[PDB]
């Protein structure tokens, strides 16, 4: 909005700001390890206590 | 030199008898500025501090 002024000045008309905001992108990654001996037992079936 | 009830009127009645530029880098006198708001008590009672 704008104030109407009585003193002679250069009057700003109906202004309108169009400001956009672009998103960010955060990509996080840790790195875990697993032994192959802990997978060759995971992908078998046991018949022993 | 005029009346005390006239020289308190002419003080606050937007005289701008001895004004200065507000934000100008080099000080100037204003060209009949109604945009700025200022009052000079050193022009009324005529004493520098």
Curated annotation (Swiss-Prot), chain A:
Locations listed in the record: Virion; Host nucleus
Domain of life: Viruses
Subunit structure of this chain's protein: Homomultimer. Makes the hexons and eleven out of twelve pentons. Interacts with triplex proteins 1/TRX1 and 2/TRX2; adjacent capsomers are linked together in groups of three by triplexes, heterotrimeric complexes composed of one molecule of TRX1 and two molecules of TRX2. Interacts with scaffold protein; this interaction allows efficient MCP transport to the host nucleus. Interacts with capsid vertex component 2/CVC2. Interacts with the small capsomere-interacting protein/SCP.
Function: Self-assembles to form an icosahedral capsid with a T=16 symmetry, about 200 nm in diameter, and consisting of 150 hexons and 12 pentons (total of 162 capsomers). Hexons form the edges and faces of the capsid and are each composed of six MCP molecules. In contrast, one penton is found at each of the 12 vertices. Eleven of the pentons are MCP pentamers, while the last vertex is occupied by the portal complex.
Family: Belongs to the herpesviridae major capsid protein family.
Name this polypeptide is given: Major capsid protein
Gene giving rise to this polypeptide: MCP
Parent sequence residues shown: 100 to 148 of 1381
């Amino acid at each position: 909005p704008t104030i109407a002024h009585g003193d002679g000045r250069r009057p700003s008309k109906q202004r309108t700001f169009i400001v956009v905001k672009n998103c960010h992108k955060h990509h996080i990654s840790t790195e875990m390890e697993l032994s192959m001996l802990d997978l060759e037992i995971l992908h078998s079936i046991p018949e022993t206590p | 030199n005029r009346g005390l009830y006239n020289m308190v009127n002419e003080y606050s009645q937007r005289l701008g008898g001895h004004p200065a530029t507000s934000n100008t880098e080099v000080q100037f006198v204003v060209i009949a500025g109604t945009d700025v708001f200022l009052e000079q008590p050193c022009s009324f009672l005529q004493e520098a501090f």
